[PDB]
Design a protein around this ligand. Sequence first.
Ligand SMILES: CC(C)c1ccccc1[C@@H]1CCCN1C1CC2(CCN(c3ccc(C(=O)NS(=O)(=O)c4ccc(NC[C@H]5CC[C@](C)(O)CC5)c([N+](=O)[O-])c4)c(Oc4cnc5[nH]ccc5c4)c3)CC2)C1
Length: 144
Amino acid sequence: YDNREIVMKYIHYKLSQRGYEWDAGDDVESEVVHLTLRQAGDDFSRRYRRDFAEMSSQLHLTPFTARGRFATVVEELFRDGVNWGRIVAFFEFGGVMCVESVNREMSPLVDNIALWMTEYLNRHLHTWIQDNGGWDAFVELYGP
Ligand SMILES: CC(C)c1ccccc1[C@@H]1CCCN1C1CC2(CCN(c3ccc(C(=O)NS(=O)(=O)c4ccc(NC[C@H]5CC[C@](C)(O)CC5)c([N+](=O)[O-])c4)c(Oc4cnc5[nH]ccc5c4)c3)CC2)C1
């Protein structure tokens, strides 16, 4: 299980739900992890549909401030610590930011966001993940 593949494939899925293409992701084109994450993120987005509708209009993305927007949101999200729900929330947020970046003619940001997600995965969330039994724990809990 490779965190960059998990990130790439999740963003590819979010972009495809809006009919948007992505070059960095055709390249990479463990499957149970991606399915479970797809399903979990979709459910999270139905549960929080009205809040996501508001967050999409209030991201205020620009090429020079999107990094700080990402960091602000993600640090607030993990303020109480880490759990599976908040990791899915993190993926869904990154998905919404990539969608809005293409939607607002800032397509290049998608490659930056995949970086920051990957980075944040490996630096600040990977320990908790191993220590709670890895991604097969997640597939154990919410899989098909
Ligand atoms: C737009 C906004 C909402 C937002 C989004 C992203 C970032 C920030 C924000 C905003 C910015 C300002 C405030 N901020 C919000 C405050 C905030 C509210 C949300 N909150 C959190 C934090 C943890 C949980 C939480 O319950 N954890 S859990 O017990 O580990 C857990 C429980 C259930 C699942 N899956 C169930 C599974 C799905 C697939 C099925 C259907 O096939 C089978 C069943 C998972 N799981 O990982 O899949 C983990 C949560 O509730 C759910 C309820 N059901 C969910 N289903 C998928 C994820 C998920 C999370 C909300 C975190 C804090 C975020």
